[PDB]
Protein backbone atom coordinates (compact mmCIF):
# COMPACT_ATOMS: atom_id res chain seq x y z
CA UNK A 1 0.00 0.00 0.00
CA UNK A 2 2.17 2.83 1.29
CA UNK A 3 5.37 3.49 -0.64
CA UNK A 4 7.69 3.38 2.38
CA UNK A 5 6.82 -0.13 3.58
CA UNK A 6 7.09 -1.63 0.08
CA UNK A 7 10.40 0.18 -0.46
CA UNK A 8 11.82 -1.22 2.77
CA UNK A 9 10.50 -4.70 1.96
CA UNK A 10 12.15 -4.59 -1.47
CA UNK A 11 15.47 -3.36 -0.08
CA UNK A 12 15.52 -5.99 2.68
CA UNK A 13 14.49 -8.83 0.33
CA UNK A 14 17.35 -7.82 -1.98
CA UNK A 15 19.78 -9.35 0.55
CA UNK A 16 18.16 -12.80 0.78
CA UNK A 17 20.89 -14.55 -1.22
CA UNK A 18 23.40 -13.42 1.41
CA UNK A 19 21.40 -13.64 4.65
CA UNK A 20 19.62 -16.93 3.92
CA UNK A 21 20.91 -20.27 5.20
CA UNK A 22 23.32 -21.98 2.76
CA UNK A 23 22.23 -25.32 1.32
CA UNK A 24 23.71 -27.91 -1.01
CA UNK A 25 22.42 -31.04 -2.74
CA UNK A 26 24.39 -33.81 -4.47
CA UNK A 27 22.66 -36.47 -6.57
CA UNK A 28 24.68 -39.60 -7.34
CA UNK A 29 23.45 -42.03 -9.99
CA UNK A 30 25.17 -45.44 -10.06
CA UNK A 31 25.28 -47.29 -13.40
CA UNK A 32 23.59 -50.67 -12.88
CA UNK A 33 22.13 -53.20 -15.30
CA UNK A 34 18.72 -54.95 -15.22
CA UNK A 35 17.03 -51.50 -15.33
CA UNK A 36 17.66 -51.21 -11.57
CA UNK A 37 19.43 -47.89 -10.97
CA UNK A 38 19.62 -46.82 -7.31
CA UNK A 39 19.86 -43.13 -6.49
CA UNK A 40 21.84 -41.47 -3.68
CA UNK A 41 20.74 -37.93 -2.82
CA UNK A 42 22.73 -36.19 -0.08
CA UNK A 43 21.65 -32.72 1.03
CA UNK A 44 23.91 -30.72 3.33
CA UNK A 45 22.50 -27.94 5.51
CA UNK A 46 23.64 -25.62 8.31
CA UNK A 47 20.43 -24.81 10.22
Amino acid sequence: DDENITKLNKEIRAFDKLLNIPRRELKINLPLTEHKSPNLSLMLESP
Partner: protein, 253 residues
Protein backbone atom coordinates in the same frame (compact mmCIF):
# COMPACT_ATOMS: atom_id res chain seq x y z
CA UNK B 1 -11.79 -5.37 25.80
CA UNK B 2 -9.82 -2.14 26.20
CA UNK B 3 -10.05 1.22 27.88
CA UNK B 4 -9.44 3.69 25.06
CA UNK B 5 -8.28 7.16 26.12
CA UNK B 6 -8.92 9.67 23.36
CA UNK B 7 -8.84 13.33 22.35
CA UNK B 8 -10.48 14.83 19.26
CA UNK B 9 -10.30 17.79 16.91
CA UNK B 10 -10.73 18.95 13.34
CA UNK B 11 -8.84 20.95 10.72
CA UNK B 12 -9.54 22.64 7.42
CA UNK B 13 -7.94 21.11 4.35
CA UNK B 14 -6.10 24.37 3.56
CA UNK B 15 -3.55 23.72 6.29
CA UNK B 16 -3.55 19.96 5.65
CA UNK B 17 -0.20 19.77 3.85
CA UNK B 18 1.46 22.04 6.40
CA UNK B 19 0.08 19.99 9.28
CA UNK B 20 1.53 16.80 7.83
CA UNK B 21 5.03 18.24 7.71
CA UNK B 22 4.86 19.40 11.32
CA UNK B 23 3.83 15.93 12.46
CA UNK B 24 6.86 14.39 10.76
CA UNK B 25 9.01 17.01 12.48
CA UNK B 26 7.79 15.75 15.87
CA UNK B 27 7.28 12.00 15.56
CA UNK B 28 10.20 11.38 13.22
CA UNK B 29 8.03 8.98 11.20
CA UNK B 30 6.32 9.32 7.81
CA UNK B 31 2.55 8.95 7.44
CA UNK B 32 1.09 5.67 6.24
CA UNK B 33 -2.02 5.46 4.08
CA UNK B 34 -4.97 3.34 5.17
CA UNK B 35 -8.68 2.83 4.61
CA UNK B 36 -11.56 0.90 6.14
CA UNK B 37 -15.27 0.16 5.80
CA UNK B 38 -17.66 -0.01 8.76
CA UNK B 39 -21.19 -1.40 8.84
CA UNK B 40 -23.53 -0.68 11.75
CA UNK B 41 -26.15 -3.22 12.78
CA UNK B 42 -29.05 -2.82 15.20
CA UNK B 43 -31.39 -5.27 16.94
CA UNK B 44 -34.35 -6.33 14.83
CA UNK B 45 -37.50 -4.33 15.73
CA UNK B 46 -39.69 -7.21 14.52
CA UNK B 47 -38.60 -9.22 17.59
CA UNK B 48 -39.97 -8.05 20.94
CA UNK B 49 -37.14 -8.29 23.49
CA UNK B 50 -39.21 -8.48 26.65
CA UNK B 51 -36.05 -9.80 28.33
CA UNK B 52 -34.86 -6.22 28.89
CA UNK B 53 -35.44 -6.08 32.64
CA UNK B 54 -37.58 -2.95 32.72
CA UNK B 55 -37.97 -2.88 36.51
CA UNK B 56 -34.20 -3.17 37.09
CA UNK B 57 -32.49 -2.04 33.85
CA UNK B 58 -29.90 -4.79 33.91
CA UNK B 59 -29.05 -4.04 30.26
CA UNK B 60 -30.10 -1.84 27.33
CA UNK B 61 -30.00 -2.62 23.59
CA UNK B 62 -26.91 -1.50 21.69
CA UNK B 63 -25.43 -1.33 18.19
CA UNK B 64 -22.75 -3.57 16.67
CA UNK B 65 -19.92 -2.42 14.39
CA UNK B 66 -18.37 -4.70 11.75
CA UNK B 67 -15.20 -3.38 10.12
CA UNK B 68 -13.11 -4.56 7.17
CA UNK B 69 -10.20 -3.33 5.07
CA UNK B 70 -10.83 -2.72 1.36
CA UNK B 71 -8.02 -2.65 -1.24
CA UNK B 72 -7.22 0.66 -2.93
CA UNK B 73 -7.97 -0.89 -6.34
CA UNK B 74 -11.63 -0.17 -5.54
CA UNK B 75 -10.96 3.45 -4.55
CA UNK B 76 -8.69 4.59 -7.40
CA UNK B 77 -10.37 5.67 -10.65
CA UNK B 78 -8.93 5.53 -14.17
CA UNK B 79 -7.26 8.94 -13.74
CA UNK B 80 -5.07 8.05 -10.75
CA UNK B 81 -2.83 5.03 -11.41
CA UNK B 82 -0.09 7.38 -12.66
CA UNK B 83 0.47 8.87 -9.22
CA UNK B 84 2.20 6.63 -6.65
CA UNK B 85 0.25 5.27 -3.69
CA UNK B 86 1.14 7.74 -0.94
CA UNK B 87 -0.60 10.35 1.21
CA UNK B 88 -0.76 13.10 -1.43
CA UNK B 89 -3.68 11.31 -3.10
CA UNK B 90 -5.85 12.62 -0.25
CA UNK B 91 -5.49 16.07 -1.81
CA UNK B 92 -7.69 14.87 -4.69
CA UNK B 93 -10.35 13.39 -2.37
CA UNK B 94 -12.38 16.58 -1.89
CA UNK B 95 -15.44 15.69 -3.98
CA UNK B 96 -18.55 14.01 -2.62
CA UNK B 97 -18.20 11.38 -5.36
CA UNK B 98 -16.10 8.25 -4.87
CA UNK B 99 -15.35 5.18 -7.01
CA UNK B 100 -16.84 2.76 -4.44
CA UNK B 101 -20.62 2.79 -4.89
CA UNK B 102 -23.56 1.05 -3.24
CA UNK B 103 -23.62 -1.97 -5.56
CA UNK B 104 -20.03 -3.01 -4.84
CA UNK B 105 -20.56 -2.85 -1.07
CA UNK B 106 -23.77 -4.85 -1.44
CA UNK B 107 -21.69 -7.38 -3.38
CA UNK B 108 -19.18 -7.53 -0.51
CA UNK B 109 -21.88 -8.67 1.92
CA UNK B 110 -13.92 -8.61 9.63
CA UNK B 111 -13.84 -7.22 13.16
CA UNK B 112 -16.84 -7.15 15.51
CA UNK B 113 -16.97 -4.37 18.07
CA UNK B 114 -19.28 -3.04 20.80
CA UNK B 115 -18.86 0.03 22.99
CA UNK B 116 -20.47 1.99 25.82
CA UNK B 117 -21.03 5.65 26.66
CA UNK B 118 -17.91 7.23 28.23
CA UNK B 119 -17.48 7.42 31.98
CA UNK B 120 -19.52 10.04 33.83
CA UNK B 121 -18.18 12.82 36.00
CA UNK B 122 -16.58 16.17 35.20
CA UNK B 123 -13.15 15.32 36.66
CA UNK B 124 -12.04 13.43 33.53
CA UNK B 125 -9.49 15.14 31.26
CA UNK B 126 -9.62 12.64 28.37
CA UNK B 127 -12.45 10.65 26.83
CA UNK B 128 -12.33 7.22 28.46
CA UNK B 129 -14.36 4.57 26.65
CA UNK B 130 -14.80 0.82 27.11
CA UNK B 131 -14.62 -1.42 24.04
CA UNK B 132 -15.36 -5.14 23.65
CA UNK B 133 -13.91 -6.68 20.51
CA UNK B 134 -13.75 -9.99 18.68
CA UNK B 135 -12.65 -11.24 15.26
CA UNK B 136 -14.42 -13.29 12.59
CA UNK B 137 -11.93 -15.36 10.58
CA UNK B 138 -14.02 -17.39 8.11
CA UNK B 139 -17.26 -19.32 7.74
CA UNK B 140 -19.03 -22.05 5.80
CA UNK B 141 -22.45 -23.56 5.23
CA UNK B 142 -25.30 -23.08 2.81
CA UNK B 143 -25.71 -19.37 3.69
CA UNK B 144 -22.19 -18.30 4.66
CA UNK B 145 -22.40 -14.51 4.53
CA UNK B 146 -22.07 -11.60 6.95
CA UNK B 147 -25.69 -10.56 6.40
CA UNK B 148 -26.98 -14.08 7.09
CA UNK B 149 -24.77 -14.35 10.18
CA UNK B 150 -25.98 -11.09 11.72
CA UNK B 151 -29.58 -11.99 10.92
CA UNK B 152 -28.97 -15.30 12.68
CA UNK B 153 -27.79 -13.47 15.79
CA UNK B 154 -30.82 -11.17 15.59
CA UNK B 155 -29.41 -7.98 14.08
CA UNK B 156 -30.21 -6.07 10.88
CA UNK B 157 -28.29 -3.56 8.77
CA UNK B 158 -28.72 0.14 9.50
CA UNK B 159 -26.13 2.10 7.48
CA UNK B 160 -22.46 2.18 6.52
CA UNK B 161 -19.63 4.57 5.73
CA UNK B 162 -16.07 4.65 4.43
CA UNK B 163 -13.02 6.15 6.12
CA UNK B 164 -9.84 7.20 4.32
CA UNK B 165 -6.90 8.86 5.99
CA UNK B 166 -3.38 8.69 7.35
CA UNK B 167 -1.84 7.29 10.53
CA UNK B 168 1.05 8.44 12.70
CA UNK B 169 2.72 6.15 15.24
CA UNK B 170 4.43 7.97 18.11
CA UNK B 171 6.13 6.73 21.25
CA UNK B 172 4.35 5.00 24.15
CA UNK B 173 1.76 3.46 21.83
CA UNK B 174 0.12 6.77 20.92
CA UNK B 175 -1.75 6.69 17.60
CA UNK B 176 -2.81 9.82 15.70
CA UNK B 177 -5.33 9.58 12.86
CA UNK B 178 -6.39 12.03 10.15
CA UNK B 179 -9.66 10.91 8.58
CA UNK B 180 -12.22 11.72 5.89
CA UNK B 181 -15.63 10.04 6.09
CA UNK B 182 -17.97 9.24 3.18
CA UNK B 183 -21.49 8.05 3.92
CA UNK B 184 -22.81 5.65 1.27
CA UNK B 185 -26.40 5.00 0.18
CA UNK B 186 -28.17 3.80 -2.94
CA UNK B 187 -29.11 7.46 -3.41
CA UNK B 188 -25.40 8.28 -3.60
CA UNK B 189 -22.28 9.11 -1.63
CA UNK B 190 -22.00 12.19 0.57
CA UNK B 191 -18.89 13.40 2.39
CA UNK B 192 -19.97 14.41 5.89
CA UNK B 193 -16.51 15.78 6.76
CA UNK B 194 -16.86 18.30 3.95
CA UNK B 195 -13.83 20.49 3.33
CA UNK B 196 -11.79 19.27 6.28
CA UNK B 197 -10.08 16.43 8.11
CA UNK B 198 -11.12 14.87 11.41
CA UNK B 199 -8.22 14.47 13.85
CA UNK B 200 -8.21 11.86 16.62
CA UNK B 201 -5.36 11.01 19.01
CA UNK B 202 -5.78 7.96 21.20
CA UNK B 203 -4.13 5.25 23.28
CA UNK B 204 -5.34 1.79 24.34
CA UNK B 205 -5.06 0.20 27.79
CA UNK B 206 -5.55 -3.56 28.05
CA UNK B 207 -6.61 -3.76 31.72
CA UNK B 208 -8.90 -1.19 33.31
CA UNK B 209 -7.90 -2.05 36.87
CA UNK B 210 -4.28 -0.93 36.46
CA UNK B 211 -4.28 2.74 37.43
CA UNK B 212 -0.58 3.56 37.23
CA UNK B 213 -0.73 2.76 33.51
CA UNK B 214 -3.88 4.85 33.07
CA UNK B 215 -2.23 7.81 34.80
CA UNK B 216 0.79 7.45 32.53
CA UNK B 217 -1.47 7.33 29.47
CA UNK B 218 -3.30 10.48 30.53
CA UNK B 219 0.03 12.21 31.15
CA UNK B 220 1.22 11.33 27.63
CA UNK B 221 -2.04 12.51 26.03
CA UNK B 222 -2.05 15.83 27.87
CA UNK B 223 1.62 16.38 27.02
CA UNK B 224 0.84 15.77 23.35
CA UNK B 225 -2.07 18.22 23.52
CA UNK B 226 0.10 20.84 25.21
CA UNK B 227 2.68 20.39 22.45
CA UNK B 228 0.17 21.31 19.71
CA UNK B 229 -0.97 24.53 21.42
CA UNK B 230 -1.57 27.39 18.99
CA UNK B 231 -1.89 25.23 15.86
CA UNK B 232 -4.79 22.86 16.60
CA UNK B 233 -7.08 22.72 19.64
CA UNK B 234 -7.61 19.16 20.88
CA UNK B 235 -10.72 18.83 23.02
CA UNK B 236 -12.82 16.27 24.87
CA UNK B 237 -15.96 15.65 22.80
CA UNK B 238 -19.48 15.69 24.23
CA UNK B 239 -20.23 12.70 26.45
CA UNK B 240 -23.78 12.54 25.08
CA UNK B 241 -22.57 12.40 21.46
CA UNK B 242 -20.58 9.15 21.83
CA UNK B 243 -23.65 7.23 23.04
CA UNK B 244 -24.63 4.42 20.66
CA UNK B 245 -27.63 2.81 22.36
CA UNK B 246 -30.70 2.10 20.24
CA UNK B 247 -33.18 3.98 22.44
CA UNK B 248 -31.64 7.36 21.54
CA UNK B 249 -30.32 8.21 18.09
CA UNK B 250 -27.32 10.40 17.30
CA UNK B 251 -23.97 9.80 15.61
CA UNK B 252 -20.78 11.79 16.16
CA UNK B 253 -19.46 12.47 12.69
Amino acid sequence: MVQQLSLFGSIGDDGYDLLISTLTTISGNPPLLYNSLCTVWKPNPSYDVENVNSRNQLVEPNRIKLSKEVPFSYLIDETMMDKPLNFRILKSFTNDKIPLNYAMTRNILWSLQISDIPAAGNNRSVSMQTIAETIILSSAGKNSSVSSLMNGLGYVFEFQYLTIGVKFFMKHGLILELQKIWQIEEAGNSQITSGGFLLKAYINVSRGTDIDRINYTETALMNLKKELQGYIELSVPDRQSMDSRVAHGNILI
